[PDB]
Chains A and B, each alone.
Chain A
Amino acid sequence: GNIKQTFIKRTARELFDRYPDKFTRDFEHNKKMVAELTNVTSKTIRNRIAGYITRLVRMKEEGK
């Protein structure tokens, strides 16, 4: 199942709450920003967080 965990989604939303412009619509840029901002030593967790942030940026820039 490709279901994002509650803490993944929550940390993504919390990092989009502030630092709202450090992120963009590029998975690699979001990877870099995540690794710079938070202390996560799991590539999979970090990549899932970055993907969720990407989807959030898309949803925001398009509206809802």
Chain B
Amino acid sequence: QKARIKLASTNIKALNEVTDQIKQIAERTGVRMSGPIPLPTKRIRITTRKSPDGEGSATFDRFELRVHKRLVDIEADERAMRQIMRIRVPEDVTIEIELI
């Protein structure tokens, strides 16, 4: 039985923080871990017009919200679960765990 953990965030530094924390968690003990694996970055694009009126040449603002995604597999041992679940996650990162 193995455990998979998915990380999503807008900030890369927090991602690296959590991933290196769990990497040390898994290296102190001898356990097999794959990754972290980078998934395609997802962008929410929104193009809109600047002027609040209709007069004048048309001009457009293009806003983007980027989301980076990492995947990890941890082999799901008791010690690993114990000393992993006890890590304060920075609020700018979402993390979801589940066993295969």
Decide if A and B touch, CB cutoff 8 A: no
Which residues of A are interface residues toward B (Cβ below 8 A)? none
Which residues of B are interface residues toward A (Cβ below 8 A)? none
